[PDB]
Amino acid sequence: HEFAELFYRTYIVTPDQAGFQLSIRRNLVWEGWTGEGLSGEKQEISKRNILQGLLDYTTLETNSTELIPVIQSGENDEQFIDPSVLPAQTVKQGKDTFDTNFLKFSENGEGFNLLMLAQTPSRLKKGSMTFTDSLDSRIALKQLLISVTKGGTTELFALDVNRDQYAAYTATREYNFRLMQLKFHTSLGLGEESTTVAGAESALLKDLFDLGYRIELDVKVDGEMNVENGNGDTSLRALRLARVFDKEGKEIALTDSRVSAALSGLTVTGVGYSLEARLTNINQLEMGLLIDSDVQKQGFMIPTLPPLVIVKPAMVEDDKTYPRLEALTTAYRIQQMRNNAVTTLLNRADTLKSYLGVGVPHPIESNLGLEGVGQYYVRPYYNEATIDVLNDLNNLTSAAKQTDIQGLIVSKINEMVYTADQLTGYTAALEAAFSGRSPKPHVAIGTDMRLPQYIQINGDDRTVGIGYDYTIARISDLRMKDKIVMTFILPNESEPHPLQHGVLGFIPEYLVDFNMIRNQRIGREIRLTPRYRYFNFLPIMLVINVINLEEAIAQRTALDVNETQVTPAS
Amino acid sequence: HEFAELFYRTYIVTPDQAGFQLSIRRNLVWEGWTGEGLSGEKQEISKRNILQGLLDYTTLETNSTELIPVIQSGENDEQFIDPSVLPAQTVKQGKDTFDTNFLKFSENGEGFNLLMLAQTPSRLKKGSMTFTDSLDSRIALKQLLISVTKGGTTELFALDVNRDQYAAYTATREYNFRLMQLKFHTSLGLGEESTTVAGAESALLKDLFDLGYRIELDVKVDGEMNVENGNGDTSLRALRLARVFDKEGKEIALTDSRVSAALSGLTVTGVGYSLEARLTNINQLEMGLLIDSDVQKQGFMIPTLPPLVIVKPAMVEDDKTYPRLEALTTAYRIQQMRNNAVTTLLNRADTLKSYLGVGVPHPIESNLGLEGVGQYYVRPYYNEATIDVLNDLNNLTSAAKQTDIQGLIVSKINEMVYTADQLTGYTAALEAAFSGRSPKPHVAIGTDMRLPQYIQINGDDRTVGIGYDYTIARISDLRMKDKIVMTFILPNESEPHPLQHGVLGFIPEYLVDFNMIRNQRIGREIRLTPRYRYFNFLPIMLVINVINLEEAIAQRTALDVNETQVTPAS
Amino acid sequence: HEFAELFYRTYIVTPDQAGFQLSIRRNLVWEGWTGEGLSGEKQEISKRNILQGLLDYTTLETNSTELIPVIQSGENDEQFIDPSVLPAQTVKQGKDTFDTNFLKFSENGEGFNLLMLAQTPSRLKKGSMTFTDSLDSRIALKQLLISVTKGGTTELFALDVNRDQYAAYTATREYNFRLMQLKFHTSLGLGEESTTVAGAESALLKDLFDLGYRIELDVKVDGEMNVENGNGDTSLRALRLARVFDKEGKEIALTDSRVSAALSGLTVTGVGYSLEARLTNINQLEMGLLIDSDVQKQGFMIPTLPPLVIVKPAMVEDDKTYPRLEALTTAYRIQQMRNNAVTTLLNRADTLKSYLGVGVPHPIESNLGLEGVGQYYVRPYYNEATIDVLNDLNNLTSAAKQTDIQGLIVSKINEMVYTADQLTGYTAALEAAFSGRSPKPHVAIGTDMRLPQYIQINGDDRTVGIGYDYTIARISDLRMKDKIVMTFILPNESEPHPLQHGVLGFIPEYLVDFNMIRNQRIGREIRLTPRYRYFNFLPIMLVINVINLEEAIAQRTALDVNETQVTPAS
Secondary structure, three states: OHHHHHHEEEEEOOOOOOOOEEEEEEEEEEOOOOOOOOOOOOOOOOEEEHHHHHOOOOOOOOOOOEEOOOOOOOOOHHHEOOOOOOOOEEEEEOOEEEEEOOEEOOOOOOOEEHHHHOOOHHHHHHOOOOOOOOEEEEEEEEEEEEEEEEOOOEEEEEEEOOOOHHHEOEEOOOOOOOEEEEEEEEEEEEOOOOEEOOOOEOOOOHHHHHOOOEEEEEEEEEEEEEOOOOEEEEEEEEEEEEEEEOOOOOEEOOOOHHHHHHHOOEEEEEEEEEEEEEEOOOOOOOOOOEEEEEEEEEEOOOOOOOOEEOOOEOOOOOOOOOOOOHHHHHHHHHHHHHHHHHHHHHHHHHHHHHHHOOOOOOOOOOOOOOOOOHHHOOOOEEEEEEEEHHHHOOOOOOOOHHHHHHHHHHHHHHHHHHHHHHHHOHHHHHHHHOOOOOOOOEEEEEEOOOHHHHOOOOOOOOOOOOOOEEEEEEOOOOOOOOEEEEEEEOOOOOOOOOOOOEEEEEEOOOOEEEEEEEOOEEEEEEEEOOEEEEEEOOOEEEEEEEEOHHHHHHOOOOOOOOOOOOOOOO | OHHHHHHOEEEEOOOOOOEEEEEEEEEEEEEEEEOOOOOOOOOEEEEEEHHHHHOOOOOOOOOOOEEOOOOOOOOOOOOEOOOOOOOOEEEEEOOEEEEEOOEEOEOOOOOEEHHHHOOOHHHHHHOOOOOOOOEOOOOEEEEEEEEEEEOOEEEEEEEEOOOOOOOEOEEOOOOOOOEEEEEEEEEEEEOOOOOOOOOOOOOOOHHHHHOOOEEEEEEEEEEEEEOOOOEEEEEEEEEEEEEEEOOOOOEEOOOOOOOOHHHOOEEEEEEEEEEEEEEOOOOOOOOOEEEEEEEEEEEEEOOOOOOEEOEEEOOOOOOOOOOOOHHHHHHHHHHHHHHHHHHHHHHHHHHHHHHHOOOOOOOOOOOOOOOOOHHHOOOOEEEEEEEEHHHHOOOOOOOOHHHHHHHHHHHHHHHHHHHHHHHHOHHHHHHHHOOOOOOOOEEEEEEOOOHHHOOOOOOOOOOOOOOOEEEEEEOOOOOOOOEEEEEEEOOOOOOOOOOOOOEEEEOOOOOEEEEEEOOOOEEEEEEEOOOEEEOOOOOEEEEEEEEOHHHHHHOOOOOOOOOOOOOOOO | OHHHHOOOEEEEOOOOOOOOEEEEEEEEEEEEEEOOOOOOOOOEEEEEEHHHHHOOOOOOOOOOOEEOOOOOOOOOHHHEOOOOOOOOEEEEEOOEEEEEOOEEOOOOOOOOOOOOOOOOHHHHHHOOOOOOOOEOOOOEEEEEEEEEEEOOEEEEEEEEOOOOOOOEOEOOOOOOOOEEEEEEEEEEEEOOOOOOOOOOOOOOOHHHHHOOOEEEEEEEEEEEEEOOOOEEEEEEEEEEEEEEEOOOOOEEOOOOHHHHHHHOOEEEEEEEEEEEEEEOOOOOOOOOOEEEEEEEEEEOOOOOOOOEEEEEEOOOOOOOOOOOOHHHHHHHHHHHHHHHHHHHHHHHHHHHHHHHOOOOOOOOOOOOOOOOOHHHOOOOEEEEEEEEOOOOOOOOOOOOHHHHHHHHHHHHHHHHHHHHHHHHOHHHHHHHHOOOOOOOOEEEEEEEOOHHHOOOOOOOOOOOOOOOEEEEEEEOOOOOOOEEEEEEEOOOOOOOOOOOOOEEEEOOOOOEOOOOEOOOOEEEEEEOOOOEEEOOOOOEEEEEEEEOHHHHHHHHHOOOOOOOOOOOOO
């Protein structure tokens, strides 16, 4: 039948096995294990699924090879800026906690070593740095600091320079072939929205921004770096108040009184800088993240069902008196497939609403008492929405009633489907599992034959989705009156996956005909012993319950008469 | 992931070079050099980009070779009209400032020499006209000054004749084969909207216009001029009040009482005229705009990224036993391609917000801090708007809620796209940059998985694209919760180009399998060291964020029940 | 650039000619010349365009050759009805005027010669007819006059009979081969609203008519006539009241009291009739209206224009150093096409406004001062309208503003298009221009790049073209900010034509390479001197001036907070 086909796709197994088994492979990040101390206790493994990385972002944020300065009290203080203008800041690299601060410009021209400057506590336990380490091809200034002082008040700006492409170190030939040169000759723009290091707008220049002026600063910084031993230095060359622009961007000279009043006595000077660079890690000094795969399996069993039998005169009359064979298949089709499918669906609905709760998600693989193996891939979720048609709708006119009903129903269906999609991350799982193409997720709409006219919206073409395709089915059971059941299914592939909603374990059963005696009777019997069952994988299902639709539709004819009959006027 | 590949077009680079460099070719209009080092300053070569000719109309105008009479006392005063009838006017051509006025009509057969009459100071510097110049093939009348005098009151009119059918000299041989003829015998109409030189309708003819009449004057003007040395003359032969027309287009005589009073003693006389003449410029004696091309370029280089790790038993084969650890590849994908992309996009959003301010266009090449090249082509512009769903809308019925929401969001999107393009002139840049084809501009919309129900209107085919092509992408990340990021892309191109939004500089990495001793453990290691970077070219971006939408959706439930249960009447 | 050629077709012109000229062969219908009297003044020939016949029907029509009974008092009145029953009526044919009346039903057996019971003064002046001409094969009754007498009150009814096929004389020989008889055997009915000769509803049949009754009169008319020599006869043979119809079609007899009251003593007798007969004009006695061809000529000149120059150091190769002409091509395109297009368009718009005024149609060929040859085919017309977006609307919510603005703009633009086309007769002129195919008239929409989001209405297959097709273009100029310019164009043809809106007479330009020494500089030079000019032919234009739109746009952000926050109820 169509309804059973839509939700659980038929999968046939040769009658030699008791069922089918699924093997599900998972990918996971291993940060380590607990139990390097001894307590004679469970070893507890910190394990989590990588597919959770489809939603969260902190799941994979790795910078262990990156070079950043490390603060050491009394060892390299003289190469750093004083802590009297910007105290130390806390940063986390890997699992180590340590502080850093901005480098100092070479006042006279003595250099700094980056390899010595970056001694993380983890690498200290690793063994002192050797010569084999090599700085990456990419080295650049990432953040530059300036000091705005006017009258004795100093405000600091944390200006991101890494975006400009002149901060990229460029290769030079000058010394052997190794030194890497920085040419940073441009104008630095401090805008109206530029905020202080503490996170606030400036006040010394606030007079110009109240007039909405932007100030240009010309910055001249130069330096050199060697990619073999971390040896190098960078120096400040020149910096001066460059230009000022009005609303439209037209140039306003420095001598103009519009800005000289707010720029008198105003000093801008370079203070410190930070260097963004890595190694060329081929020494494998740095450990990444362990990626591990486990096999999870579940077994499925296929039973035998109660039999169905026919009485027949054994000797003769096997063609026209008493039923021919086709009645057997008719009974088989009517009862075993359609009738059992509906009961299975409703059982799934009650099981979800019971175990999972209404409108509440769960962590990936946080439930083990549910059906199927989709919990490895999708977040558990369920919801139930009730539409009170009479309460939310009211119109005396009996002509646009269809449109109002359709608007309500389609509104609820779309919003609920898409809220569930957002909370599940299903489309991400589909995109990750398949390669070469990302078929659009399919939404299943299986309902009774009362509602379907309120699902398709007149005058339109896209009915229930703009990123979805749909299929509407009708079933004639008396249980599903005024009920809307929806879930995610795949339309094409015919083999069991955790992404597929449901399967029909089917064993072809051969018709057994033979003569058996009953109590004082001789008759041939023909028997149909089915072997089938429905299984489910997705822990996702959304239900709409509508009541009192009849009263609202009857309100069409319950309106109060409004007649108009007067002499025509023209 | 479809979102990532939508904005950043994958560019493949062989693993032998640190990156790629783009040589951008600019063309400029030279105007003049300002500042000298004889006073402590440097030269600033004033160069302005032609592409702003897309948006302005004066920088690239030129009328150097057009002939205009010059005024000075005692040397050419005779060939001009009396200066006390209409004072001289100051008109500016090239770098020379001068005066002009109408030529007085010949009466005795004595005319004028236009060529020698039309020497501007720049031509004086070059040396006086020898025989070298040549009046071009086209000569036409510019304007006729006719004075409507009634009694003692004189009124002046400035009628443009250069748009007439027969105001252009027609070549004819009845004489020397360089003589050029004019035969202008037609009627010009002075209507009810014709305006005097100093403004406002004429007082003398106000009566006819208040009744909506029109005045036709037969004009007979003839003149001869030679295109070899500039001997010429023009004589007015006839001018007389000819017809009067009513409001519907019917003739009214010159004597009828409807117009007799306002036309009794009315005299019209022709006073002066001008000419459109220019040198044939076989001569190379006056130079137009001087155009120069400069070559700018940028270095775009490629880093490497921290690695990923697998642990495997050592004493077995890795070449024929056990998979290639697909978990590694999936972890690489999710970790590296997707999250870095959204992080870079959001950082670009914040950086533009910080630098350019909201809704403030800047002139081209007026800033250098932004990463990319498109600032050499398109005006920088960043505008963001927040839409408050509950405040700006008023609804309680569930059925019509999405209709209202769609109207709101689509209206805002169309507003933002059209206004942003207007301020940037994007499509003009595309038209000028591409010769031989013009790709229809494509607008990109990238958002989370919640909104897209509202981006696309129900019932139509043109949702956000009225004159644009759109592509909607969805991401499941939690950063972009109910947000929309918008910018322009190019559909069918695969290289770095100044009008591309951004490129993913990709160089594939080498899978590495070796044994490494790790804390007294002998295990196989499989490391993949990703290496890529998200670049950014186009300095225009549009971001809208929806808030408080949840309460508006809940308003589908927070309606007050309007229940009317009245007895059916008919 | 689309906005350019969408308005002006780029018509190539050979470099040998100085321009192109058009000859417009004009059809004129002759009416009459005044001044055959001896005075020695300008003769004015009344010539009027047949193309004006597209609007009016009184342009070309004649009834001269068709014979009309003329009254000649005192000589032939015996053959006419006594004018004491009906006063003589005058009719106009050609330049002759004469009085006419119905011929009497001759029961006394003596007939009438229709030829000699006709002849106008013009026919007499040309010569009294002498059986030079025969009569047409079709002759039929035109009018029957029947007198209704009841109680001494007489009412006259002028019944139109020419629309029955039994009154058309049927060729049936029995005596001569040119003799036809007439049998009129049918019923004539008088309706409840049939107006009488006096021009009002009846007073003796009013009783029946007011109740919705109708009266049927059976008429039995026979007549004989020979086209050989104008011999003919006609006699009345029978007339009575036949039956009476109700307002449904059921028969009611005379004896019935409902109709017997108004038919007592009611006697109806026919008194006269008229004839539809005419000459075969095999001998061509009569002159028709005259048609002549006159030729018009207009010449157009292609002028030279300012040049553009690139300086280039000379003694080296011109190949791979300094602009290789790319800057020349870009500057040429931009400067010489795009700015000049909008310049000419706007100047033409103001020129039309200056002459034609707002909303004032003009008769065909009534203006010659305008540019173009379109005045020879269609009525000149110019209209101007301004939409005050904020002042014409009142809405607060931001959601529906898009649709409302779209509807307003589309309504106004379509109404203006249709009004202009009706008042100009452009479509009829286009249809008369070609035979075998009539292309659908095309409307061009060139406007700035702000509005186009409003010209399209969502969900509309037919957007602005209800009985036309359209094309939408955009341009980035600042002058056209919030302006729409309109006309009609011909997309399927590319050649000059009086129905073409405008054409670019363009000349291919030859690169010039001569070395000019300039202030002791030896520099390589390249020249690209344009020559072209924009022209206007059709004097039709429509402009929409949308102002204050930005404020109504911001009115989306100006609504006064309508929030409804109440506890959910269900």
